[PDB]
XYZ file of C-alpha atoms in Angstrom:
330
model
C 3.951 179.047 -24.893
C 6.720 178.932 -22.336
C 9.932 177.661 -22.010
C 12.263 176.504 -19.040
C 15.860 175.631 -19.011
C 18.624 175.092 -16.318
C 21.692 177.222 -16.659
C 24.878 175.812 -15.075
C 28.236 177.536 -14.164
C 31.141 176.678 -16.361
C 33.509 176.453 -13.448
C 34.039 176.697 -9.670
C 33.953 180.567 -9.976
C 31.005 181.182 -11.861
C 32.891 182.715 -14.525
C 29.863 182.134 -16.951
C 26.848 179.977 -17.477
C 25.786 177.644 -20.049
C 22.279 176.545 -21.167
C 21.578 173.744 -23.392
C 20.029 174.677 -26.639
C 18.447 172.461 -29.404
C 19.310 173.316 -32.956
C 18.156 171.713 -36.095
C 16.501 168.416 -37.081
C 17.329 165.983 -35.547
C 18.294 168.178 -32.910
C 22.009 169.161 -32.117
C 22.322 170.181 -28.511
C 24.775 172.826 -27.778
C 25.587 174.790 -24.536
C 25.394 178.342 -25.150
C 26.113 181.380 -22.986
C 22.955 183.376 -22.519
C 23.994 187.013 -22.953
C 21.509 189.874 -22.363
C 24.421 192.039 -23.288
C 24.255 191.141 -27.079
C 22.018 190.060 -29.753
C 23.576 187.568 -31.893
C 22.915 183.799 -31.544
C 26.374 182.369 -32.829
C 27.707 178.871 -32.586
C 30.955 176.924 -33.223
C 30.190 174.765 -36.200
C 31.689 172.495 -39.057
C 32.685 175.681 -40.837
C 35.031 177.010 -37.978
C 38.513 177.096 -38.623
C 39.862 173.632 -37.417
C 42.784 175.188 -35.607
C 40.423 177.346 -33.594
C 37.964 174.374 -32.160
C 39.376 172.684 -28.981
C 36.679 170.599 -27.439
C 33.714 172.621 -28.224
C 30.566 170.856 -29.508
C 29.852 171.902 -33.205
C 26.660 172.687 -35.190
C 26.658 170.887 -38.475
C 24.106 172.339 -40.703
C 24.486 169.788 -43.499
C 23.107 167.154 -40.780
C 19.985 169.280 -40.299
C 16.905 168.783 -42.557
C 15.753 172.115 -41.499
C 18.803 174.098 -42.112
C 18.872 176.815 -44.842
C 21.640 179.066 -45.903
C 20.760 182.733 -45.417
C 22.336 183.521 -48.593
C 24.772 186.532 -48.662
C 24.512 187.195 -44.982
C 27.573 187.487 -42.912
C 28.121 188.582 -39.127
C 31.111 189.726 -37.068
C 31.129 190.929 -33.425
C 33.571 191.967 -30.997
C 32.898 191.888 -27.072
C 33.917 194.285 -24.221
C 36.462 191.752 -23.220
C 38.202 192.139 -26.560
C 37.186 188.751 -27.893
C 35.372 188.378 -31.329
C 34.054 185.893 -33.839
C 32.547 185.841 -37.308
C 30.995 183.777 -40.087
C 28.056 183.115 -42.056
C 24.368 182.541 -41.236
C 21.853 179.612 -41.588
C 18.115 179.695 -40.503
C 17.156 176.565 -38.374
C 14.603 175.357 -35.716
C 15.839 176.417 -32.204
C 14.288 175.096 -29.038
C 15.320 176.298 -25.403
C 13.742 174.553 -22.524
C 10.629 173.220 -24.596
C 10.128 176.449 -26.364
C 10.684 176.399 -30.131
C 11.310 178.997 -32.605
C 11.255 178.103 -36.380
C 13.477 180.285 -38.800
C 15.839 181.533 -36.124
C 19.099 183.081 -37.563
C 22.011 180.746 -36.451
C 25.186 182.383 -36.952
C 27.908 179.996 -37.915
C 31.403 180.875 -36.925
C 34.247 180.619 -39.373
C 36.621 182.230 -37.197
C 36.594 182.651 -33.306
C 39.275 184.691 -31.216
C 41.535 182.786 -28.855
C 39.396 183.225 -25.538
C 36.719 181.259 -27.238
C 38.988 178.523 -28.403
C 40.542 178.173 -24.940
C 37.055 177.950 -23.407
C 36.030 174.188 -24.040
C 32.575 174.568 -22.175
C 31.050 177.413 -24.365
C 29.715 176.209 -27.571
C 28.398 179.806 -28.486
C 26.302 182.626 -27.474
C 22.683 183.312 -27.413
C 22.010 186.972 -27.296
C 19.049 188.516 -25.349
C 19.713 192.148 -25.789
C 17.699 194.146 -28.216
C 17.634 193.092 -32.067
C 18.883 196.629 -33.023
C 22.323 195.215 -31.889
C 22.454 192.115 -34.142
C 25.306 192.295 -36.327
C 23.967 190.222 -39.169
C 24.521 192.073 -42.708
C 23.004 192.996 -44.888
C 19.859 192.048 -43.375
C 19.675 192.428 -39.469
C 18.286 189.479 -37.704
C 16.128 188.938 -34.584
C 17.077 187.450 -31.312
C 15.526 184.279 -30.073
C 13.319 186.202 -27.676
C 12.226 188.581 -30.287
C 11.114 185.756 -32.440
C 9.377 183.754 -29.720
C 7.713 186.980 -28.014
C 4.442 187.067 -29.892
C 3.973 183.300 -29.087
C 4.872 183.540 -25.367
C 2.222 183.479 -22.704
C 3.769 186.864 -21.524
C 6.463 188.846 -23.385
C 9.129 188.265 -20.713
C 11.968 186.033 -19.755
C 13.679 185.699 -16.254
C 17.149 184.979 -15.201
C 17.784 183.297 -11.962
C 21.476 182.723 -11.594
C 22.876 180.495 -9.012
C 26.066 181.147 -6.607
C 28.186 178.387 -7.279
C 25.075 176.309 -8.252
C 22.763 175.780 -11.241
C 19.828 178.288 -11.897
C 17.126 178.842 -14.447
C 16.114 180.948 -17.598
C 12.331 181.143 -18.018
C 10.533 182.074 -21.078
C 6.919 183.487 -20.997
C 5.987 183.297 -17.477
C 7.207 184.507 -14.053
C 7.721 181.665 -11.397
C 6.340 183.200 -8.232
C 7.867 180.392 -6.179
C 11.417 181.339 -7.239
C 11.788 184.740 -5.302
C 10.904 186.166 -1.981
C 8.863 189.582 -1.188
C 7.737 191.431 -4.143
C 9.444 192.271 -7.525
C 10.365 196.008 -8.054
C 10.155 197.043 -11.643
C 12.292 199.783 -13.026
C 12.482 201.889 -16.337
C 14.689 200.696 -19.100
C 16.214 202.689 -21.816
C 16.664 200.777 -25.261
C 18.488 203.683 -26.856
C 21.814 201.862 -27.046
C 20.225 198.417 -27.471
C 20.915 197.251 -23.976
C 18.721 196.549 -20.931
C 19.891 199.813 -19.623
C 18.442 201.094 -16.255
C 19.263 203.381 -13.205
C 19.941 201.883 -9.716
C 19.117 204.347 -7.045
C 22.144 203.846 -5.001
C 24.514 201.749 -2.923
C 25.666 200.476 0.502
C 28.856 198.767 1.602
C 28.209 196.085 4.268
C 26.388 197.485 7.293
C 27.006 200.871 6.114
C 24.284 203.531 5.472
C 22.917 203.600 2.073
C 24.052 206.465 -0.369
C 21.245 207.766 -2.649
C 22.893 208.319 -6.058
C 21.784 207.488 -9.512
C 23.886 204.933 -11.287
C 23.071 204.190 -14.922
C 23.916 200.716 -16.073
C 23.263 197.535 -18.056
C 21.748 194.142 -16.816
C 24.320 191.859 -18.402
C 24.209 188.102 -18.078
C 27.070 187.758 -20.305
C 29.634 189.642 -18.010
C 31.075 187.923 -15.082
C 31.617 190.819 -12.602
C 30.055 193.999 -11.385
C 31.526 197.165 -12.820
C 30.564 200.479 -11.194
C 31.950 203.972 -11.135
C 35.473 204.375 -9.407
C 34.214 206.336 -6.512
C 31.684 203.581 -5.442
C 34.279 200.744 -6.024
C 36.855 202.718 -3.939
C 34.177 202.946 -1.208
C 33.794 199.324 -1.264
C 37.523 198.184 -1.265
C 38.478 200.699 1.343
C 36.512 198.258 3.903
C 38.636 195.436 3.135
C 42.113 195.420 4.855
C 44.966 195.285 2.285
C 42.841 195.603 -0.897
C 44.319 197.738 -3.741
C 43.908 198.370 -7.293
C 46.780 196.790 -9.092
C 47.678 198.051 -12.646
C 49.653 194.762 -13.237
C 46.858 192.403 -12.336
C 44.040 194.628 -13.989
C 41.917 195.709 -11.109
C 41.246 195.374 -7.417
C 42.695 192.582 -5.598
C 42.567 191.515 -1.967
C 44.171 189.369 0.485
C 42.724 185.894 0.238
C 42.724 185.860 4.124
C 40.008 188.466 4.168
C 36.278 188.323 4.950
C 34.522 190.449 2.229
C 31.596 192.724 3.234
C 28.449 192.638 1.360
C 27.293 195.157 -1.243
C 23.791 196.613 -1.647
C 22.212 198.235 -4.697
C 19.068 200.005 -5.135
C 16.258 199.078 -7.383
C 13.765 202.106 -6.650
C 13.120 202.046 -3.109
C 13.987 198.150 -2.777
C 17.424 196.841 -2.212
C 19.375 193.918 -3.478
C 22.126 192.449 -1.214
C 25.107 191.021 -2.706
C 26.815 188.660 -0.023
C 30.593 189.027 0.424
C 31.208 185.689 -0.758
C 29.912 186.336 -4.274
C 32.668 189.058 -4.515
C 35.387 186.632 -4.092
C 36.920 185.186 -7.620
C 39.698 183.400 -5.985
C 43.616 183.499 -6.376
C 44.941 185.848 -9.189
C 47.117 182.657 -10.109
C 47.093 179.243 -8.891
C 48.251 179.333 -5.373
C 48.492 182.922 -4.712
C 47.462 184.587 -1.817
C 46.156 187.638 -3.734
C 42.501 187.087 -4.712
C 40.589 189.060 -7.369
C 37.678 191.159 -6.678
C 34.238 190.783 -8.019
C 33.401 194.638 -8.133
C 35.721 196.521 -10.407
C 35.914 199.975 -11.799
C 33.800 200.656 -15.131
C 36.135 203.707 -15.743
C 37.181 203.302 -19.381
C 34.470 200.961 -20.236
C 32.049 203.870 -20.836
C 29.050 202.064 -19.213
C 28.323 200.527 -15.889
C 27.686 196.794 -16.001
C 25.433 194.819 -13.598
C 26.997 191.507 -14.459
C 26.513 188.155 -12.988
C 27.932 189.186 -9.457
C 24.977 191.494 -8.988
C 22.154 189.455 -11.115
C 22.896 186.188 -9.366
C 21.850 187.755 -5.993
C 18.283 188.505 -7.504
C 15.487 186.992 -9.495
C 15.529 189.254 -12.700
C 12.588 189.945 -14.871
C 13.430 191.140 -18.520
C 9.930 192.487 -19.572
C 9.839 192.854 -23.327
C 6.376 194.556 -23.337
C 5.772 197.473 -25.901
C 7.644 199.593 -23.068
C 10.258 197.219 -21.815
C 11.152 197.305 -17.850
C 13.523 195.282 -15.569
C 12.241 193.719 -12.393
C 14.251 192.614 -9.509
C 13.360 190.494 -6.565
C 15.402 189.119 -3.526
C 15.516 185.313 -3.363
């Protein structure tokens, strides 16, 4: 089997992407944030504290003939941005772009933190990291991809995120029309539950490539590119007036600037992030200070190849017995 779904930016900055997901019978369609940095499929629901729901579409298990309470199971998660959610668990039928999993754990939120409430466009998350990170207790549950894997034509999914435009998540096949050149594959460590890999280096604009190992995670659920402070400083030093602002919480730059590109290495190959992808616009409405799309990972504890990086590539998440990651230009 295969599936293919379009993923759409939630706003004009590409702060996140939402993908329609069918849950239950008859289908209830919710727009979920596909997150290769976590492993819980959780949704706003009829059980969510009413004061914490503000415009989201909810899953109502009592209206699904295929929903079954997973008795005794609870979940609770905290994300790297400090947001969190928790609740209980149902199993139900879940379909993405024509690909159907029966008995999928659908984690129903009883509580969500303010960041989720305030974002009307995201109805929940669909985790695509390794199932070892799943938070369901006392019986850990499998991700949608893990459940689908054995049925898929090939045990893979691909992320093809757009810049200021829709893109595509495919399951079970590699669309050879979706990228240019060849796909370069690179080794993955699953020890921390993430799609963790090692970039071979970087360049800033038309500058020379610096060969240096940068361990990090491929994370569709993180907006920006978080790299070591040395790398980030080298980038922003090429932008007149750019500085790290403690008050704002990262690098800012004059909105009048033209940003250089940023290249990262995948083996002997190179992915180029155009300068425009690194612009996240005014820090507040009407400001002439703009927020940068490359920020320091210092204090996160891990480097994160988030959407800024991933949207410059066609990315293969290969869930074969020995997982790997593939990157192509597009």
